[PDB]
Design an enzyme around this catalytic site. Structure first.
Site, short mmCIF file in Angstrom:
data_model
loop_
_atom_site.label_atom_id
_atom_site.label_comp_id
_atom_site.label_asym_id
_atom_site.label_seq_id
_atom_site.Cartn_x
_atom_site.Cartn_y
_atom_site.Cartn_z
NE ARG A 1 -42.01 -30.85 101.28
CZ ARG A 1 -42.33 -30.46 102.51
NH1 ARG A 1 -43.27 -31.11 103.19
NH2 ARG A 1 -41.71 -29.42 103.07
CB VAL A 2 -39.07 -36.43 101.50
CG1 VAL A 2 -38.63 -36.78 102.90
CG2 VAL A 2 -39.55 -37.67 100.76
N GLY A 3 -40.08 -33.77 103.35
CA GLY A 3 -39.61 -32.64 104.11
C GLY A 3 -38.55 -33.07 105.08
CG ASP A 4 -38.43 -30.90 108.72
OD1 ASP A 4 -39.30 -30.24 108.13
OD2 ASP A 4 -38.57 -31.28 109.91
CB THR B 1 -43.56 -31.12 111.31
OG1 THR B 1 -43.45 -31.18 109.87
CG2 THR B 1 -42.81 -32.29 111.93
CB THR C 1 -42.29 -27.41 113.55
OG1 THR C 1 -43.41 -27.16 112.68
CG2 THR C 1 -42.14 -26.23 114.53
N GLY C 2 -41.58 -26.14 110.83
CA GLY C 2 -41.48 -24.96 109.99
C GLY C 2 -41.21 -25.30 108.53
#
Ligand code: NA
Ligand code: NA
Lengths: 296, 294
Positions: A184-187, A156, A207-208
């Site tokens: 899929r959805v991340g942060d 990201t 990020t991460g």
């Protein structure tokens, strides 16, 4: 009025090769340069964070827009969010495809809808109806990510800006994690997790490990420490220390407070970061490697 | 061990007529009973909130599962999230379609994937791989929701289990005539809900745009961290959403010690609580009735 600052980050990552390192630097320099150029024109902190993130979506060396990592069907599926610190105005998009700058659509979502979050097909339809161009598939996929997906079967980008009115903002963009499940959805598109912006506290872009950032709501937690009178460094230390011991997640973040303070901290191995303030450019990837140069 | 607790809520929304409140009451009661039955039978907090929300999804009266509101296109699209406060594990879906129980789909993301959040086409594809049935979309569409679109709110549950674990579950159809693939707060951790054994657990309802903006659930808990009591903390966060973003709504919170509250800045918020062999219910500010549990 306040001294404008732009902070930019690449993906929290493991060791980088001596080579990516070269193009990463200039990628980070290019984005921090646009973000700042925008604030010297007197632009808003929102314009600047948007600007910076576009540059990174377009730069193939970064996991967002063109150059995003591939999902389990080998396709590009992207998330983005932007937040206006003035009145907490926001827009975000998740699972978007075939578009160049998901961050611009997040902005369009914030500024021309009654909503803060559009996903997948309704995200495409809003882009279609706002006249965002569909791109002939192929273009988004880079030969480096192609190999990467076969291998398993990067991270990201974000920006935080403070403007002359004391307005703060953040913007994040990502294509996610290699071989991720479809949808899929991340942060990133999740406010509080992938970022938060509040004129009363400051702005954070993270990020991460996406799920780990979500579980801890990292960006808002970093800010909680600040409200409690911690420095930008101690807050980032403490919020990342928590994400490490509570859920075993690694990442990084960039914060700027409502008083002109900023730092970039990470628990991953690398995080390319850049900051422009008072016409000096700061840059780094590993800790200590920080360079400071003039910025005409 | 802790005395276990479940609290439920329907939507933090506008006035409800006398004629239909009895009917929302029947819904709330069933949901709390279902949650507390799981808890008293040695079931987890996560078990208990999924069971309570599943029930409100199944009840065509509440804006989740059957009886969701219709987006701009006379269509049903559902958001859900569930969280376990021990390890902070979580599951969430957004814009899921043609399935009966989104919260059940949410828990399968938590347990069965290395992810926490799926949306639309990918979730639908995940549902299939999990054997979750694809059910007539119009069987989720009620007559009233076809009507109200032409011319209620987010539901939820918190619980504290006997082992001392906390969980929230929240499921919605969203808001009437929303754009295609509009996602509210309900599947966004910290807005739609938050659960942390070391503080407590919150579920939220109302205008979802406002709830996303202030991170309502995690904020409430931030105040609980500062020494504010549940009602106090609930009043500050809900007060701040109204002041800062001009947003109304409600929430339920259960703290690690077992203190709980239902609070709303909206007109109504159906809610029911279960603990110490008693049921607590209300819809309007100051009308609580405490009966014995069956
Ligand atoms: Na890129
Ligand atoms: Na229902």
């Amino acid at each position: 009025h306040m001294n404008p600052i732009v902070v930019v980050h690449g993906g929290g990552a493991g060791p980088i090769s001596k080579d990516r390192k070269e193009r990463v630097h200039q990628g980070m320099v290019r984005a921090a340069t646009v973000g700042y150029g925008i604030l010297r024109e007197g632009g808003s902190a929102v314009d600047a964070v948007e600007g910076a993130v576009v540059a990174l979506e377009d730069d193939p060396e970064f996991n967002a827009g063109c150059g995003s990592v591939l999902n389990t069907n080998g396709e590009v599926e992207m998330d983005a969010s932007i937040m206006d610190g003035k009145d907490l105005s926001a827009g975000a998009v998740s699972a978007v495809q075939c578009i160049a700058n998901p961050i611009k659509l997040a902005r369009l979502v914030m500024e021309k809808t009654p909503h803060c979050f559009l996903t997948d097909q309704g995200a495409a339809q809003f882009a279609a109806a706002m006249g965002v161009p569909e791109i002939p598939g192929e273009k988004l996929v880079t030969e480096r990510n192609k190999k990467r997906l076969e291998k398993e079967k990067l991270g990201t980008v974000g920006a935080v800006a403070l403007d002359c009115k004391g307005n703060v903002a953040y913007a994040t963009s990502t294509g996610g994690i290699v071989n991720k499940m479809v949808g899929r959805v991340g942060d990133s598109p999740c406010l509080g997790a992938g970022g938060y912006a509040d004129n009363d506290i400051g702005a954070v872009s993270t990020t991460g490990h996406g799920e780990s950032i979500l579980k801890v709501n990292l960006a808002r937690l970093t800010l909680f420490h600040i409200e409690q009178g911690k420095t930008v460094e101690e807050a980032a230390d403490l919020s990342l220390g928590y994400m490490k011991s509570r859920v075993k997640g690694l990442g990084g973040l960039i914060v700027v407070s409502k008083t002109g303070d900023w730092v970039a901290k990470w628990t991953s191995t690398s995080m390319p970061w850049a900051a422009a303030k008072d016409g000096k450019l700061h840059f780094g990837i590993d800790p200590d490697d920080t360079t400071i140069t003039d910025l005409p």
